[PDB]
Amino acid sequence: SLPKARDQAVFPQNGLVVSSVDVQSVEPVDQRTRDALQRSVQ
């Protein structure tokens, strides 16, 4: 379509097609990414 890839993630084994992939929120779990990037906030 740098450039956009496609709009279809097909598995030929069973015909399962992942039309799109959606990721909700980046958690990072550790408390040190946490209120240390919070000093970055400040």
Place this chain on the structure above:
Amino acid sequence: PHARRALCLLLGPDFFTDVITIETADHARLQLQLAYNWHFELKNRNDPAEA
């Protein structure tokens, strides 16, 4: 080595949720979960030898 046992040999596409313990050139010991998208292949599904 020997955990599962079944009467049927699954020929359909499947996967193995295997984890390896590899080591890179920087000696970085990391385990990593694999899939191994596999499927059996038979060009002539009647021949006794190939089957």
